[PDB]
Amino acid sequence: SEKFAFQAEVNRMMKLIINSLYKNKEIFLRELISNASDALDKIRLISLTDENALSGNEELTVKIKCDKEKNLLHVTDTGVGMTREELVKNFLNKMTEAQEDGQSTSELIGQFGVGFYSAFLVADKVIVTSKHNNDTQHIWESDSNEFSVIADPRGNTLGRGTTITLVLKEEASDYLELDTIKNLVKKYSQFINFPIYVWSSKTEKTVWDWELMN
Numbered sequence: 744s745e746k747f748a749f750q751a752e753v754n755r756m757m758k759l760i761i762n763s764l765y766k767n768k769e770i771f772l773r774e775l776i777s778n779a780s781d782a783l784d785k786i787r788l789i790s791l792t793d794e795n796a797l798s799g800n801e802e803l804t805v806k807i808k809c810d811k812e813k814n815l816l817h818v819t820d821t822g823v824g825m826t827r828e829e830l831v832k833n834f835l836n837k838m839t840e841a842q843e844d845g846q847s848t849s850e851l852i853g854q855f856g857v858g859f860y861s862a863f864l865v866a867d868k869v870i871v872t873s874k875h876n877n878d879t880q881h882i883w884e885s886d887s888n889e890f891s892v893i894a895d896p897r898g899n900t901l902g903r904g905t906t907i908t909l910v911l912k913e914e915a916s917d918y919l920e921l922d923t924i925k926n927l928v929k930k931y932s933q934f935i936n937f938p939i940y941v942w943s944s945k946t947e948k949t950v951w952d953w954e955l956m957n
């Protein structure tokens with residue numbers, strides 16, 4: 744246990760992202776997939792230098808899982824991951840100039856790679872479970888007011904990578920429907936060089952398995 748407050752600029756950034764993409768809320772998923780792509784690409788580049796870089800996990804995928812009963816959305820990647828330092832220690836000019844003119848800013852959020860906070864448009868709480876190659880697995884938890892970085896009591900469960908858990912808003916319950924998620928993945932997966940899976944049910948006999956989207 745250890746609680747922390749966000750830096751002035753980060754608090755100012757969260758409000759801006761929420762304003763800029765208030766109507767186009769579905770952009771959260773594009774961002775989550777963007778971070779997952781950036782992480783996977785980085786560990787793939789590390790694998791070219793370090794022979795034992797992928798030992799933690801041989802797979803290089805994005806696994807999206809819905810939980811209707813507990814009202815949770817999980818986006819798991821087998822990317823580079825994040826250390827304890829990277830979780831504890833984690834644009835404004837070019838944004839504010841474009842805001843005053845009425846110009847489109849959706850592309851800027853993705854350009855500067857600060858799109859993670861778009862998850863707070865749909866979630867009341869965000870949980871980040873991350874595992875990096877030469878550090879222990881940690882849990883970053885935030886409701887936008889405060890953030891806490893704890894050591895995962897389960898230990899090394901991911902191998903390598905990160906899971907983004909979303910305690911979704913009452914209004915955002917629609918983003919739990921498999922069909923809604925499936926269509927949204929296919930819309931923002933075109934540029935991604937890694938396979939993206941969704942835990943689907945065909946269906947009284949029910950069959951559950953990871954369905955490839957890209």
Ligand SMILES: Cc1cn(-c2cc(F)c(C(N)=O)c(N[C@H]3CCOC3)c2)c2c1C(=O)CC(C)(C)C2
Nearest residue numbers: 778779781782785829830833857859871883905
């Ligand atoms: C900004 C920002 C980006 N990501 C973010 C969030 C992520 F989910 C990822 C990811 N999928 O790995 C990711 N990957 C980069 C690490 C270096 O290479 C890419 C970054 C985070 C932030 C935060 O401010 C809080 C955070 C540390 C919980 C997460």
